[PDB]
Amino acid sequence: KPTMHSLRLVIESSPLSRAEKAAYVKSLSKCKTDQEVKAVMELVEEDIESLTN
């Protein structure tokens, strides 16, 4: 059911900017396994809670 595309959709859904969106998306594209990409996903969570404060 879940996919890598849905994840990309999450980024292009949250109210991010230009720079952080691009930077993160490139970093996300740099995926390979799962535990790694997950840790990077954890960063998305923090990023919003930072941008939003």
Hey, what amino acid is at 42?
E
Which residue type sits at 31? C
Place of tokens 């997950």: 38
Helix H or strand E segment including 45: helix 35-51
How are the residues of the chain apportioned to helix, strand and coil, as percentages rounded to the nearest 5?
A: 70, 0, 30
Contact by Cβ (8 Å): 47, 16: yes
Interatomic CA distance for residues 38 and 33, integer angstroms:
9
Spelled out in words, what is the top-level CATH class assigned to the domain 1-53?
mainly alpha
Tokens of 38: 């997950």
Query: Distance between CA 39 and CA 45 in Å, rounded?
Result: 10
**End-to-end CA separation in angstroms for the chain:** 32
- Say how far apart CA 20 and CA 18 lie, in whole Å: 6
